C-alpha cells in the first residue's frame, strides 16, 4: 500500500569529482596579467556544508598542474614583445674586477641602428652567466638557446591570484585546522573562488605564504618513501632580510633600430657582497618546532644538512628580490641535529626559470640598491633513507601545493530522481 512513482528533482545537493578550467579574479602592470582578470567580489561569500565530510588529496589535485602551466604561460606571454638578444651572442673579451661573487668587465663588438656599422661597447657580466672558451669568454646560453631580456617596464611583483570555478561547478575548501592535506575533512565549506594566492617562486624556503593556525603542520604522500617531497608549513614566520648592496647603474646600448640592450654599467661606491639575514634563536626556535613534528612520523634522531649538489638553481635558495634573482647558500640554515645568520648569495642575469627546453631570460640590471624583506612561512625537505633531511624541494609545482591543499574542484549534478507517493494526473 505505497504506490511509489519516480519524481524528478532539480537542484539537489550532490556533486562529482571533476577537473575544469579555472579563470582568474583580482582586486582593485606585472607579468601575471592581473589587469585581465575580473574584479573580485569585495565580500567573498562562503557556504558552510554542515554534516559533510569530503576526501581531499593535495597531491593528486589538478589546480596545481593547471596553475603551474598558467604561470609558465604568463611568463612566456610577457616575454613575447620584448627584445631578443641574438646579437648579444658575440665573442666577449673579459677582464677581472678590482685589486664569492666574481664580476667581469667585458668588451665586445656590437651592432647598431645601421646594419653596416658596429660599435665597441663594454659591459659588466656576473661570472655565473658566462663561461670561458679557452681571456675570451662567452655567454653561457649561446650554445643551447637564445635569450629574451625582460621588458624593463613589467615587474615580477607577485600579487594575489584568485582561481574561480565556472558556473555549474564548485570548489570545496577544507577548514579543519590540523588537516593533513590528504584524507577526510570534517569542516568542509564550498566557495566560488580560492583566496588570494601569490605566485611566489622560490626554492627550499617558501617565502610569503599562508601559516599554520597552530602547530607546524607537515604534509607528504608516502612518508615512508623518501622520493616523495615533504612540505613543511610554519606556524610563526621567521623574517628573512635580503639586500644587494652594490649601487649598480644601467647603461643602455642600441643593438638595432628599436632594440636597446640594457648593459650593466659601473658600480658606484663600494663593492660588497649580496646576502640575506635571518634571525638566530628564531630560526633555531622554529627549527626545533619542525624537529618535534618530524619525529612524530619517524619514532630517533633527526639531522639537518645542506643540499646534495648539481645545478645552482637546485642547490640554493633561489628567489626574486627587487628585480634581480638571488641564489643564496643555505648551508648555514640547515645545520643542526635534533646575532644573525648570514647567507652568501650570488646574483645571475641569465636564468631559465621553469627548467624548460632551451628558453632563458636576461634579467636587466636594476639601478641603485636592492633590498627586500620576506616572511619564511614554509619549507620543503628531502629524506635520504639518523633520519636526515636535506633542503631540496623536488619540483616547482610544490610551491602551489602548499597553498592549494585546502581546495578541491567538483562539478554540480543538480538532477536527482527519488520515489514519492505522487503521480502525474
Amino acid at each position: 500500500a505505497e504506490n511509489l512513482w519516480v519524481t524528478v528533482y532539480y537542484g539537489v545537493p550532490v556533486w562529482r569529482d571533476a577537473d575544469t578550467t579555472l579563470f582568474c579574479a583580482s582586486d582593485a602592470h606585472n607579468v601575471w596579467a592581473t589587469h585581465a582578470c575580473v574584479p573580485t567580489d569585495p565580500n567573498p561569500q562562503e557556504i558552510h556544508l554542515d554534516n559533510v565530510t569530503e576526501k581531499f588529496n593535495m597531491w593528486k589535485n589538478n589546480m596545481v598542474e593547471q596553475m603551474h602551466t598558467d604561470i609558465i604561460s604568463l611568463w612566456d606571454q610577457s616575454l613575447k614583445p620584448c627584445v631578443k638578444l641574438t646579437p648579444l651572442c658575440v665573442t666577449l673579451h673579459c677582464t677581472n674586477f678590482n685589486p664569492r661573487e666574481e664580476i667581469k668587465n667585458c668588451s665586445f663588438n656590437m651592432t647598431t641602428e645601421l646594419r653596416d656599422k658596429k660599435q665597441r661597447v663594454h659591459s659588466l657580466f656576473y661570472k655565473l652567466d658566462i663561461v670561458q672558451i679557452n681571456s675570451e669568454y662567452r655567454l653561457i646560453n649561446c650554445n643551447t638557446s637564445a635569450c629574451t631580456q625582460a621588458c624593463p617596464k613589467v615587474s615580477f611583483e607577485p600579487i594575489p591570484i584568485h582561481y574561480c570555478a565556472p558556473a555549474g561547478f564548485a570548489i570545496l575548501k577544507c577548514k579543519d585546522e590540523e588537516f593533513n592535506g590528504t584524507g577526510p575533512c570534517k569542516n568542509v565549506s564550498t566557495v566560488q573562488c580560492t583566496h588570494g594566492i601569490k605566485p611566489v617562486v622560490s626554492t627550499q624556503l617558501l617565502l610569503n605564504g599562508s601559516l599554520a593556525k597552530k602547530e607546524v603542520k607537515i604534509r607528504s604522500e608516502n612518508i615512508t618513501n623518501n622520493v616523495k617531497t615533504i612540505i613543511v608549513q610554519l606556524v610563526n614566520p621567521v623574517i628573512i632580510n635580503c639586500t644587494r648592496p652594490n649601487n649598480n647603474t644601467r647603461k643602455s646600448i642600441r643593438i638595432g633600430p628599436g632594440q636597446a640592450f640594457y648593459a650593466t654599467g659601473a658600480i658606484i661606491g663600494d663593492i660588497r657582497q649580496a646576502h640575506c639575514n635571518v634571525s638566530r634563536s628564531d630560526w633555531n626556535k622554529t627549527l626545533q618546532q619542525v624537529a618535534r613534528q618530524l619525529r612524530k612520523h619517524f619514532v630517533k634522531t633527526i639531522i639537518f644538512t645542506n643540499s646534495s649538489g648539481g645545478d645552482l638553481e637546485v642547490t640554493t635558495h633561489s628567489f626574486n628580490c627587487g628585480g634581480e634573482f638571488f641564489y643564496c647558500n643555505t648551508s648555514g640554515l640547515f645545520n643542526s641535529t635534533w646575532e644573525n645568520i648570514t647567507l652568501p648569495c650570488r646574483i645571475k642575469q641569465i636564468i631559465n626559470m621553469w627548467q624548460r627546453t632551451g628558453q632563458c631570460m636576461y634579467a636587466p640590471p636594476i639601478p641603485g640598491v636592492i633590498s627586500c624583506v620576506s616572511n619564511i612561512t614554509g619549507l620543503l625537505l628531502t629524506r635520504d633513507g639518523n633520519e636526515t633531511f636535506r633542503p631540496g624541494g623536488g619540483d616547482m609545482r610544490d610551491n602551489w601545493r602548499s597553498e592549494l591543499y585546502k581546495y578541491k574542484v567538483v562539478k554540480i549534478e543538480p538532477l536527482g530522481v527519488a520515489p514519492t507517493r505522487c503521480k502525474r494526473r
Binding site: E2, N3, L4, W5, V6, T7, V8, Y9, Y10, G11, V12, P13, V14, W15, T20, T21, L22, F23, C24, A33, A36, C37, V38, I47, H48, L49, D50, N51, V52, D70, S73, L74, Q77, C164, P166, A167, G168, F169, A170, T190, V191, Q192, K411, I412, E413, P414, L415, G416, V417, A418, P419, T420, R421, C422, K423, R424
Partner: protein
Amino acid sequence: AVFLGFLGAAGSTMGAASNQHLLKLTVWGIKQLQARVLAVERYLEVQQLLGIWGCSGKLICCTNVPWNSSWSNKSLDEIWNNMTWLQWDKEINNYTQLIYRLIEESQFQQEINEVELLAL
C-alpha cells in the same frame, strides 16, 4: 554566478534538503572565455532533460513511471528521513540511465494522448 546555496544542506537528509567587454586572447582571456562557454553548455545539458521530460520551469515534477522496486528496496522512512542526496545517488547511480529513459517516454506517450483528448 547562480547559487551554491542549494549546497547548504549537503549533509542533511533528503527530506530536509528538498524542503567589462572586449575579448582578448590572453592566457586569462582564453581561460575566462571557455568558462563562459562551459557554463552555458553544462546548464542546457541539464535543462534539455527537464524539457524533454515535460518538466521545464519546474523544481519538483511528479511523473507517471512506477517505482520498480529493483532500483531500491528501502522504505520511505529509510530514504527521506535518513539518506542524504549525496549518498542516495551512489546507491541508485546504476539505474539512473535506465530511469532517465522511462521518464523520457512517459512524457512522449502523454503527448499523443493529449492530442487525441483535445480533439473532442
